[PDB]
JSON list of C-alpha atoms in Angstrom, two decimals:
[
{"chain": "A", "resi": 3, "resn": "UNK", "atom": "CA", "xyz": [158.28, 106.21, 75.32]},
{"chain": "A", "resi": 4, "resn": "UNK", "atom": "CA", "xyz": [158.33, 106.80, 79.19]},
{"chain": "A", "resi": 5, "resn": "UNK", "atom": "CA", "xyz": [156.64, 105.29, 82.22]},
{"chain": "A", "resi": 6, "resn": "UNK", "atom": "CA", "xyz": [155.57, 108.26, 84.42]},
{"chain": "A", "resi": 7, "resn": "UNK", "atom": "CA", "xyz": [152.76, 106.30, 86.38]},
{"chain": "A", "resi": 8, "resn": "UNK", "atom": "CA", "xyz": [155.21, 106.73, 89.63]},
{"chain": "A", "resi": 9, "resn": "UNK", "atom": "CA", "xyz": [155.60, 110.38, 89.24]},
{"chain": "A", "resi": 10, "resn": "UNK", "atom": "CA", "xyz": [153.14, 112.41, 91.77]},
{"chain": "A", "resi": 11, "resn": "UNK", "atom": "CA", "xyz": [150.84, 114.97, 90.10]},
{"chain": "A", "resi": 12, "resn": "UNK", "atom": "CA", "xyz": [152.75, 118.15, 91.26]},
{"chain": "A", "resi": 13, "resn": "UNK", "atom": "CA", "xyz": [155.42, 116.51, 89.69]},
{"chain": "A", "resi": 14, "resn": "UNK", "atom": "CA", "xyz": [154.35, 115.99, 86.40]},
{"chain": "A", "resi": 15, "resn": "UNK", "atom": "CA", "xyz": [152.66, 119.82, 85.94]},
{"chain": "A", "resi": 16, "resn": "UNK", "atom": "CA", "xyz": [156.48, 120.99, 86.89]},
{"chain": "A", "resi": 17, "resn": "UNK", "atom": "CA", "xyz": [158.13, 118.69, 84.59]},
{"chain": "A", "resi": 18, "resn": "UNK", "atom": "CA", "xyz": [155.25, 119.93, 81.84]},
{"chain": "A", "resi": 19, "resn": "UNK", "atom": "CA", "xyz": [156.54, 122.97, 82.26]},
{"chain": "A", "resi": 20, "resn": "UNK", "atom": "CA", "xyz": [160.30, 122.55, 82.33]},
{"chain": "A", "resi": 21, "resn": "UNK", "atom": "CA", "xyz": [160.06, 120.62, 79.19]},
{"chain": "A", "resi": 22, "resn": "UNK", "atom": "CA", "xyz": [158.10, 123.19, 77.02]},
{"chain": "A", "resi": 23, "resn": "UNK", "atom": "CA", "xyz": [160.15, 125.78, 78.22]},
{"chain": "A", "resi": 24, "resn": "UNK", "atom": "CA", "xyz": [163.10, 123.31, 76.63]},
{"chain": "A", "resi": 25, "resn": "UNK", "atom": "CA", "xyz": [160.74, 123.32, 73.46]},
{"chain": "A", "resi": 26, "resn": "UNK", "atom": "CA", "xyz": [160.80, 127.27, 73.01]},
{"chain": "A", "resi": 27, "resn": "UNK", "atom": "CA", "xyz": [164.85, 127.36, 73.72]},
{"chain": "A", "resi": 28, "resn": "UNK", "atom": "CA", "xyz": [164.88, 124.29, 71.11]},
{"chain": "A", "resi": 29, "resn": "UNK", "atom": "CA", "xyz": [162.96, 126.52, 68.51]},
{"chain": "A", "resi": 30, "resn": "UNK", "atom": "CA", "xyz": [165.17, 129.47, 68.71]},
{"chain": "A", "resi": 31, "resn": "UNK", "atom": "CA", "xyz": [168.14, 127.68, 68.51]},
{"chain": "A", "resi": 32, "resn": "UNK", "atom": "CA", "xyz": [167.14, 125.78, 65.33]},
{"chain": "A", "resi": 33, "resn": "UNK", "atom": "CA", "xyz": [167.75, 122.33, 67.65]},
{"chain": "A", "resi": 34, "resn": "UNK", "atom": "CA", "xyz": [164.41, 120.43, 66.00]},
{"chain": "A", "resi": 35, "resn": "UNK", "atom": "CA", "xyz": [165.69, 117.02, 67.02]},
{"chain": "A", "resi": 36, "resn": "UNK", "atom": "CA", "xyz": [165.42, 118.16, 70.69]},
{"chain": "A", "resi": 37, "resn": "UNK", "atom": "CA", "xyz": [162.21, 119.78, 70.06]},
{"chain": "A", "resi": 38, "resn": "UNK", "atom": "CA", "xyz": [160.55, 116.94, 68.52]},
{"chain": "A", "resi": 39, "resn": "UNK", "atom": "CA", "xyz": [161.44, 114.87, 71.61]},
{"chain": "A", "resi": 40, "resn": "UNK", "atom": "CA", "xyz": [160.61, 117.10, 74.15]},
{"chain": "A", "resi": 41, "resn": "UNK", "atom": "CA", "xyz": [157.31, 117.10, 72.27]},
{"chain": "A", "resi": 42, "resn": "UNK", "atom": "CA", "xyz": [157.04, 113.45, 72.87]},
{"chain": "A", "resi": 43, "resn": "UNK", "atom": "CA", "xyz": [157.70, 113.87, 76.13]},
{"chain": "A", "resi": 44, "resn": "UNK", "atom": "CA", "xyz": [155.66, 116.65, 77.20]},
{"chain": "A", "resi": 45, "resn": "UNK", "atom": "CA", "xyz": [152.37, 114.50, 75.32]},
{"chain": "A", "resi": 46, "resn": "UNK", "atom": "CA", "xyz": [153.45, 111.74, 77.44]},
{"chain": "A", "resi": 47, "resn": "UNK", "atom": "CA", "xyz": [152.94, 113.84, 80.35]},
{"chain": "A", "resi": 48, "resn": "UNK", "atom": "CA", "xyz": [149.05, 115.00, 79.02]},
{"chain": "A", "resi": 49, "resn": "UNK", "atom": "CA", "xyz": [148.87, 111.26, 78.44]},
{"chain": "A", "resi": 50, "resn": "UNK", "atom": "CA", "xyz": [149.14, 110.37, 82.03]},
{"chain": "A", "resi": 51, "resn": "UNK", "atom": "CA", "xyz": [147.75, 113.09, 83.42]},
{"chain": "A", "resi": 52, "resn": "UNK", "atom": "CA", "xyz": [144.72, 112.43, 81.66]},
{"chain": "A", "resi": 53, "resn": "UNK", "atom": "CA", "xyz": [144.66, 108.59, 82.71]},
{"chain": "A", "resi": 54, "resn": "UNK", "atom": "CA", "xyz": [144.24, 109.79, 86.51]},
{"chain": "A", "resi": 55, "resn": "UNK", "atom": "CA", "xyz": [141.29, 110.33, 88.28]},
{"chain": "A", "resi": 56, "resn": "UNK", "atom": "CA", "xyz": [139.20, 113.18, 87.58]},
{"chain": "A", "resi": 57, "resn": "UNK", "atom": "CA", "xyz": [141.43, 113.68, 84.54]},
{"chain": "A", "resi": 58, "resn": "UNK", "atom": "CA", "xyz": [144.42, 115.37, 85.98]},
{"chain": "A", "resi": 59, "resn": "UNK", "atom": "CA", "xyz": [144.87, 117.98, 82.75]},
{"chain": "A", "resi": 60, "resn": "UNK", "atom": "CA", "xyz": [142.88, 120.59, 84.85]},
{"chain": "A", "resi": 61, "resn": "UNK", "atom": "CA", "xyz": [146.27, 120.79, 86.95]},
{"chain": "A", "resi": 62, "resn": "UNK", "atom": "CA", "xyz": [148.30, 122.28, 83.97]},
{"chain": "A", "resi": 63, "resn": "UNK", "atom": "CA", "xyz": [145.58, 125.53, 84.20]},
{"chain": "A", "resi": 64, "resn": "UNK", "atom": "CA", "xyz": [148.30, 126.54, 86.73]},
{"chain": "A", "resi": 65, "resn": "UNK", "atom": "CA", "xyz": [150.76, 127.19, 83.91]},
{"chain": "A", "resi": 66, "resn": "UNK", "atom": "CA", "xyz": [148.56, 129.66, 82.35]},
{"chain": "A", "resi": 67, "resn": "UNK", "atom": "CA", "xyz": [150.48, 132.69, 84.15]},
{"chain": "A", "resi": 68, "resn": "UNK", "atom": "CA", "xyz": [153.65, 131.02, 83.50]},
{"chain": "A", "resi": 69, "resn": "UNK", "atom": "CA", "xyz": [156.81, 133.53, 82.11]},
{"chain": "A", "resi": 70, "resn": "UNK", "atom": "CA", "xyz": [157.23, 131.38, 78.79]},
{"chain": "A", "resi": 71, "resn": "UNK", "atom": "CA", "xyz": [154.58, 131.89, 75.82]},
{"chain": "A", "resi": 72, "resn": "UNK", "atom": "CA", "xyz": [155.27, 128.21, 74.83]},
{"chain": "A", "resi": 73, "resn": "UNK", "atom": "CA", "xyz": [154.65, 126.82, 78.11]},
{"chain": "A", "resi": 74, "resn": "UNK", "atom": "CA", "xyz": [151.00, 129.02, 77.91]},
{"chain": "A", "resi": 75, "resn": "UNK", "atom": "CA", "xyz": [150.23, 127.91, 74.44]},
{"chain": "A", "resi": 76, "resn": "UNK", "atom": "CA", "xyz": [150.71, 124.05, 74.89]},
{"chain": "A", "resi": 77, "resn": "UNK", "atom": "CA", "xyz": [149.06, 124.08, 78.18]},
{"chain": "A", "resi": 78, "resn": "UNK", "atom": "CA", "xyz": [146.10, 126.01, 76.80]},
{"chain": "A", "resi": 79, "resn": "UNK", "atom": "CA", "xyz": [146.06, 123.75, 73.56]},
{"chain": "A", "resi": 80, "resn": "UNK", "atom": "CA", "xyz": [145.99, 120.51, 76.25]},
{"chain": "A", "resi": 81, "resn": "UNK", "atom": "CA", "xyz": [143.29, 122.17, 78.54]},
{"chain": "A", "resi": 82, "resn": "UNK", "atom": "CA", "xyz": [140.59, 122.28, 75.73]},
{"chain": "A", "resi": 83, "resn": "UNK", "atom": "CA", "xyz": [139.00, 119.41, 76.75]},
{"chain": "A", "resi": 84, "resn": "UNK", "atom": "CA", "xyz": [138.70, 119.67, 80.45]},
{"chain": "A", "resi": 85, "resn": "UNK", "atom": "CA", "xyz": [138.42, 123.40, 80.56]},
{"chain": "A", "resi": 86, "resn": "UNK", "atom": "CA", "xyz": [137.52, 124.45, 77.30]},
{"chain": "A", "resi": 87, "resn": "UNK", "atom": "CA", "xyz": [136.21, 127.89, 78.27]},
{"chain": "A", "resi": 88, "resn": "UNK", "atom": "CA", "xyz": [139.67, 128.99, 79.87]},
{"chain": "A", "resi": 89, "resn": "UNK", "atom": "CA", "xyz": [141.37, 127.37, 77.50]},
{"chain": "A", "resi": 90, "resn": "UNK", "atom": "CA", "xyz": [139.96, 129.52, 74.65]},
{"chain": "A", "resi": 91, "resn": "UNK", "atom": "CA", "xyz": [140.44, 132.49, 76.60]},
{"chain": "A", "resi": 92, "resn": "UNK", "atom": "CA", "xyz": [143.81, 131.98, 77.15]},
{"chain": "A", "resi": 93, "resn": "UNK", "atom": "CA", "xyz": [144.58, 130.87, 73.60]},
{"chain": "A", "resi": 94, "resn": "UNK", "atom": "CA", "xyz": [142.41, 134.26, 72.43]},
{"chain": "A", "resi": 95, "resn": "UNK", "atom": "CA", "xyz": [145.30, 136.41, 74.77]},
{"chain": "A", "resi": 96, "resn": "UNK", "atom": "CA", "xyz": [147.89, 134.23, 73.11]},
{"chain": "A", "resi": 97, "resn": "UNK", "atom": "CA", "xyz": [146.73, 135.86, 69.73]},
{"chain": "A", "resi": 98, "resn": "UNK", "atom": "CA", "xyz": [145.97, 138.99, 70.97]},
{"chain": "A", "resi": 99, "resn": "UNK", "atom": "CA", "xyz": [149.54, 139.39, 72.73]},
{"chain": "A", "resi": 100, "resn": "UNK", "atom": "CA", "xyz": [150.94, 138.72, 68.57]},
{"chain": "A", "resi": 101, "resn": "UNK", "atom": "CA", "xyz": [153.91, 136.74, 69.79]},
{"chain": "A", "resi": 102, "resn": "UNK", "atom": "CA", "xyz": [154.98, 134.67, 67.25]},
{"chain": "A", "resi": 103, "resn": "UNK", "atom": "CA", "xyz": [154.80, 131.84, 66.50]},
{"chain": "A", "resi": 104, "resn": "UNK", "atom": "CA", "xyz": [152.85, 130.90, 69.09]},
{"chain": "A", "resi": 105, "resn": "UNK", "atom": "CA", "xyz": [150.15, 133.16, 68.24]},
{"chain": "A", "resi": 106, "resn": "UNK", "atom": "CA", "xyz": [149.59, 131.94, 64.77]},
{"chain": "A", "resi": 107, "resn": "UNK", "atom": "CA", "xyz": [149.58, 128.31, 66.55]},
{"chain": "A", "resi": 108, "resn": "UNK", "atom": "CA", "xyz": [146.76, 130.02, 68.85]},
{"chain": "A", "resi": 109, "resn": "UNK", "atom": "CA", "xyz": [144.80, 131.37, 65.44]},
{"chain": "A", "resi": 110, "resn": "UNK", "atom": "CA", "xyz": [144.88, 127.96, 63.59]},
{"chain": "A", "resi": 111, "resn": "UNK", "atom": "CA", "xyz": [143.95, 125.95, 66.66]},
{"chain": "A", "resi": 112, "resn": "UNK", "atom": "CA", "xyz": [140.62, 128.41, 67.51]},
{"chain": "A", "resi": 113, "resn": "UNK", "atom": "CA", "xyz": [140.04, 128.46, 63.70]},
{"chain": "A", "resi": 114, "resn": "UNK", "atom": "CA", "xyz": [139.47, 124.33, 63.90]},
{"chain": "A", "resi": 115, "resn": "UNK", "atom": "CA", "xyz": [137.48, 125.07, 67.36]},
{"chain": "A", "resi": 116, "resn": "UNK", "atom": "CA", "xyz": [135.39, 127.16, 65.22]},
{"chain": "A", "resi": 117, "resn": "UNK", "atom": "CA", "xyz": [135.22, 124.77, 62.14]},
{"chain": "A", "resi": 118, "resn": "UNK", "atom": "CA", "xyz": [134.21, 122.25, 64.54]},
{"chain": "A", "resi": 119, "resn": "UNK", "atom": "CA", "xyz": [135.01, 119.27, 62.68]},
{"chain": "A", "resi": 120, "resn": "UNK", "atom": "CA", "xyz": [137.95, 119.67, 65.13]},
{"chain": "A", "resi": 121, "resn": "UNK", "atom": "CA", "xyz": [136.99, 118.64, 69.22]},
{"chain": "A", "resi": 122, "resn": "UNK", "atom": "CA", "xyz": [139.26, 118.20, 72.31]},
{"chain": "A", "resi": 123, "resn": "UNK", "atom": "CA", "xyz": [139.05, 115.56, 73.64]}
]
């Protein structure tokens, strides 16, 4: 439950990714407790972002080239709304790359997209 209103922009898209790259080391290392929380933290980072001008979400496109398939999948999955093109792209490579889990994540989420009962946002 963190105030990040003071953080710059740049700031917040590096701590993004730090974090979820925390979340994929959590996973592997069965550490769920960490995982969960760097989950809350990493929302609270969309959450801002989001609350700035312009909607400040399109910044984490950067991370779509970044080396950690976690860090791709969340930023993708967060992206839907102001970038939902690229987003599904990138969340289509995701499942055609078959890394798992992430690209089962990538399946279920472009499965809702396609329901449609499901929209970002």
């Amino acid at each position: 439950k963190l105030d990040l209103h003071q953080m710059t922009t740049q700031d917040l898209v590096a701590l993004f990714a730090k974090v979820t790259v925390e979340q994929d080391d959590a996973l592997l290392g069965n550490q769920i407790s960490r995982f969960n929380r760097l989950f809350g933290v990493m929302a609270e980072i969309a959450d801002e972002l989001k609350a700035r001008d312009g909607d400040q979400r399109t910044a984490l496109l950067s991370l779509f080239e970044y080396p950690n398939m976690q860090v791709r999948l969340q930023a993708a999955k967060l992206t839907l709304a102001v970038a939902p093109v690229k987003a599904r792209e990138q969340l289509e490579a995701i499942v055609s790359s078959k890394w798992f889990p992430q690209a089962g994540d990538a399946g279920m989420c472009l499965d809702l997209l396609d329901d449609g009962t499901f929209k970002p946002k």
